[PDB]
């Protein structure tokens, strides 16, 4: 089994004990660590934070303690947009410029592979032709990765991609069955199903549905979709979130799922973003009421006019059990910095959630 965890390079700016750098990393915790995110300058792979070169070195330097650990560099992300991916996979000469830069860049900093986080090809601004080109990109990379293998005398660079869960986004940009052949694994983002972008409370990551397309916004519907489309279960890794989606309730009385909400929930004191909250900002809510949505096997907690749907140790246990049953390749996590990484808030030791994934896997 695989335990893929996403490291975040902006987490280093969280205040006090939320601050997260490579030294807060547990080298035996995950089997694969993915660094988010790498950028793109002149069709080439580039850094995005002033200390990326320094962080990369401590990051991959962890392999000195754990030779089994595999690291990949994730390029893209939401903030990155799609525009630059389009211009890169536009021609072939440019793709070569990238593929050849990726190779030099990964090898330079001791990365074992590349995680594609294009959000999203053939959607949200990306032309319909980016669908077929994405798979070409996948192919060219897989191919160069093959050839680079002989010449270098090192293990073939790994290639994975983070992918969306909804039917809409898949069709718009993913030739599943085909990309699944060149991808060593697929990190399914099985979360962000419900959020403050909705006028009704809903859970960020429900295992099962509570009808219509609504009944497709759960882990199961996401897994099933990627499976049926040609993704071998081995290659499917189940994303798990160490964070919750928050809502401000229209009325402190009516804390039901589906209850009305005026907007995003109060930004977290450490994460500073409405709609989302790290586990260490929820795990120990003083004077709140934690409940459990039986049909979706996930919990939610409210206090006053604040409502939050998050994942706890028990939900993770259930999801791994689910994952085992579907025969999936392992579990993926977003993100290391959102779990109580230093056991400074929850009294459940270091990495309550992620260590759970490790124990059950």
From Swiss-Prot:
One of its GO terms (molecular function) is hydrolase activity, hydrolyzing O-glycosyl compounds. Its main location: secreted. Its EC number is 3.2.1.14. It catalyses: Random endo-hydrolysis of N-acetyl-beta-D-glucosaminide (1->4)-beta-linkages in chitin and chitodextrins. Detected in spleen. Secreted by cultured macrophages. Transmembrane segments: none annotated. It is an enzyme of class 3 (hydrolase). Belongs to the glycosyl hydrolase 18 family. Chitinase class II subfamily. This is Chitotriosidase-1. It comes from Homo sapiens (Human). The gene is CHIT1.
């Amino acid at each position: 089994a695989k335990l893929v965890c996403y490291f975040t390079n902006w987490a280093q700016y969280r205040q006090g004990e939320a601050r997260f750098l490579p030294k807060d990393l547990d080298p035996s915790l995950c089997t694969h660590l993915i660094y988010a995110f790498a950028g793109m300058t002149n069709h080439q792979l580039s850094t995005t934070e002033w200390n990326d070169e320094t962080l990369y070195q401590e990051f991959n330097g962890l392999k000195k303690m754990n030779p089994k650990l595999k690291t990949l560099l994730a390029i893209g992300g939401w903030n990155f947009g799609t525009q630059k991916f389009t211009d890169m996979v536009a021609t072939a000469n440019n793709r070569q410029t990238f593929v050849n830069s990726a190779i030099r860049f990964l090898r330079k900093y001791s990365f074992d592979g590349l995680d594609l986080d294009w959000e999203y090809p053939g959607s949200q601004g990306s032309p319909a032709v980016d669908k077929e080109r994405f798979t070409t990109l996948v192919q060219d990379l897989a191919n160069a990765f093959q050839q680079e293998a002989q010449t270098s005398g090192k293990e073939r660079l790994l290639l994975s991609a983070a992918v969306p869960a909804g039917q809409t986004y898949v069709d718009a940009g993913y030739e599943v069955d085909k990309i699944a052949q060149n991808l060593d694994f697929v990190n399914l983002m099985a979360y962000d199903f419900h959020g403050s972008w909705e006028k009704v409370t809903g859970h960020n990551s429900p295992l099962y549905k509570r009808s219509g397309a609504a009944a497709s916004l759960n882990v199961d519907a996401a897994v099933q979709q990627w499976l049926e489309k040609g993704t071998p279960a081995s290659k499917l890794i189940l994303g798990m979130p160490t964070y919750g989606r928050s809502f401000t309730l229209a009325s402190s009385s009516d804390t039901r799922v589906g209850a009305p909400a005026t907007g995003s929930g109060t930004p977290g004191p450490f994460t500073k973003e409405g709609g989302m909250l790290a586990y260490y900002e929820v795990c120990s809510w003083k004077g709140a009421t934690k409940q459990r949505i039986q049909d979706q096997k996930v919990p939610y907690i409210f206090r006053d006019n604040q409502w939050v749907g998050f994942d706890d140790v028990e939900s993770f246990k259930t999801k791994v059990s689910y994952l085992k049953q579907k025969g999936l390749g392992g579990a993926m996590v977003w993100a290391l910095d959102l779990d109580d990484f230093a056991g400074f808030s929850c009294n459940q030791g270091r990495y309550p959630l992620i260590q759970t994934l490790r124990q059950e896997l």
